Symmetry: D2
Subunit: 253 residues, 4 copies
Amino acid sequence: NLYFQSMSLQGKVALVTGASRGIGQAIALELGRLGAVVIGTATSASGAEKIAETLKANGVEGAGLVLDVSSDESVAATLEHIQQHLGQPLIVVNNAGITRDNLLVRMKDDEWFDVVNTNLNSLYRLSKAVLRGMTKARWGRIINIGSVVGAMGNAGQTNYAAAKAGLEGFTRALAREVGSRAITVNAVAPGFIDTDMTRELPEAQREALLGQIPLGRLGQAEEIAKVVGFLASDGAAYVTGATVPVNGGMYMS
Amino acid sequence: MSLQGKVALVTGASRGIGQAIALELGRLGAVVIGTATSASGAEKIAETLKANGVEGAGLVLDVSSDESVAATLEHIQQHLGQPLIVVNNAGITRDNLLVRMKDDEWFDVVNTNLNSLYRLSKAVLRGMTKARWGRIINIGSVVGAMGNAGQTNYAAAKAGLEGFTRALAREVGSRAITVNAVAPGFIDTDMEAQREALLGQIPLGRLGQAEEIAKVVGFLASDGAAYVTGATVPVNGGMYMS
Amino acid sequence: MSLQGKVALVTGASRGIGQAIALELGRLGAVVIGTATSASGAEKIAETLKANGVEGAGLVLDVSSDESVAATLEHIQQHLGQPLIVVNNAGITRDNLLVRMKDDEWFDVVNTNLNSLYRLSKAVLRGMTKARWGRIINIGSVVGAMGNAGQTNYAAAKAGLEGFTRALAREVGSRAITVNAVAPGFIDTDMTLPEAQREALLGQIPLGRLGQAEEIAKVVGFLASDGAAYVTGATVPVNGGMYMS
Amino acid sequence: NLYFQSMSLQGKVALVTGASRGIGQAIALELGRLGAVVIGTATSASGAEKIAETLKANGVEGAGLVLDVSSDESVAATLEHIQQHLGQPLIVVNNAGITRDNLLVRMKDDEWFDVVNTNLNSLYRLSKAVLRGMTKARWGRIINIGSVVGAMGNAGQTNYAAAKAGLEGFTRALAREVGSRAITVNAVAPGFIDTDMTRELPEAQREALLGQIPLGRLGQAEEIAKVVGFLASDGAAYVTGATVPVNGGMYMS
């Protein structure tokens, strides 16, 4: 019986890939906090359900779904399902992503190819499947979650750096083809953010990373979410082709 | 709202982007002190803030003068209160091909667009250091990164503002102060045959609105942007991409 | 001359930029191995190299295996010496707006321009690491930093290329190997579209002309030299001013 | 009686500021080795004389002159003197600037103004003066020696950072006004090069410096000169508005 005010993304259908944990989770919760219908994906039914429960728990309408962004067939079918029963996503956050770390001399075929196809080729798969939706609406937001490593580089990560740097090149190029239809395309490049993955790293390696961080701390996933939530709003209608780095000053360009 | 409790200083806030930045931060709860070169400019700011239901004041400030800045800000810091969000927005152009450019034309642009950053920051940085919180948001231009024939002076000033932005951010990060830049493109208020030619260079195919700069600024001002620092946010409709 | 004693491996060397890089490292006194896609193109490289008084060879390069490349490499090292200058210039375009792009247009441009950097680069690093000296120079494009409607595939591969460059730079610097990219703008080749489009394109370039393959070759030459020993993880844009950053 | 092959810069008149030591001196010798008539300059007569020793000693045809780029009369006189005896300089290498390091809350007014003046304002008068000679000849090279600190930024160096980043901005803008006339304007951004500044260092902080450099070493002044020597040549004719960073991998963008 309380009726709250309409928020910046009220009514917009949003897709957020890899939403079961850390940054993707926080993005989903933030878009929902702002009124979107949120559709997050994970690689497993168990992730896909964790998502539905997290949306339900925070009062957010939407769905948790299974998407493998490395598979052509999984993308087309999940996206056809979304279109059939859920809505046409007008905000798409590509956050799905993986690392396969090794010096390039120690690097196996799979580790290279997997990272490229998961972090980079996915942007071709998701965008191609959603763009017709945005073009009819004459409105859209594609937001690709890149990484500090794209512009900085990092030993052990020629693969990741390659895929994430390509993600920003893709961002720019697509901004160029879709601006006429009032669809913006922007990249968000997190620095070192406190998550499942990064807590596994050892305390000497972490105490060192902090030394390279002017802000003297790791960021919180929420801090990525908020930036993404902004790029999705009308307030960022004039921003496109951009890369916003959210790194506490670990990297400046 | 999100800036309630905070005092925000916005230089050059009597029209266009600056004004809109001023109304934006006021809308989010900040007490805004917007500055203008002249008394009437200053009084008009105060009329606008009240008309929009925002609290703050208009202030005469000449950001190209060591005395006007250092003294004016000593005044505010003393009797009005302490600016924790500073938007350095004031800037001039003096367009000319370098072969043609006059001495004043070069030096006035460097001094007002670049040295002012030294002036303003010097003055508010102890207040923020003490408070362990700050937002310094420098208003650049797409010309800093991109260049523009006839604007070698403006391009140096604004490009210099981004480098200042990056260095300061490293000094003050440990005190939870973010220093960030925002590079407007071609904005409506900030301005047939050459009209089209220009829109033809913008992927969104339109000029930006002053409010579209201010929204970005409001965000950088907020708690949510705490982990962004040292950055330049181009807001240029796709005109230049970096 | 400035590259005497060195062996350079230059990929996609049968035409345009690749060919020019090859002639230029040759001019500078390198033993030059130019790769092509076809047996007939590799033969043609060898002849071109001979007609310009350059010691070298054509190579059709089998990048199917960790072992296939490394052996192609000891074969080179048997008859010619350990290649310590490697120029990655493989890559093609397959242009289209994303909504119209066919899958294989996307994967082909990504495979040929970006994945190609993995295989050869990994296989030469071992002899560079032993020699405590090397050059890897990756040929990218203005389109990586700038983007281009119709070229989201190209842009993403060429921009990956720069990312590759920077991070490899960080792994291999302690051994005096430099890793740098050269991002050519619009160049005079086979390709260059229609005369109507020609003039509007030049309008986009402060220098008012297309670049010559030779000009790209010269920048690559210099990056290969002892004088570029302190440049690494860099992208040098050779674009006529059409893009600056 | 010995006649050597002509070099890439034969006949070309070249002006190099700050040429009495380090980077500037090396730049001057390299332009000479490449066949150029080099006029190197210093702010002081002992520096101008010392430059003339070095040119003669290394067999470069040219001159050591007193130039204060702050001053219009200095600039106008130097150039007339260069014009009467040697030719129009078609290669000008703007190499200026000192540091006056401090956190901003400590920095003194003149520490700020000296650096901006020296590092940025320095570009105005000389560049303005050589241009016309270049536009008439339809050929030219302007090369502005910046610093990694423009791009990377640095605590204690807000002044140097602002001025050198400005240097790069000036570069791109100028590049666009003169490219029609076959004049290129480029910046070179040295990293930590073996110089007076780096030698003044406490060995302790000098090593901290190496560890942030992939190459594991300081740069040689010679290594800046080579890069600049190349940008002067015909080979670099299609490069303009660029910042070539020579930093050993200390910063990558």
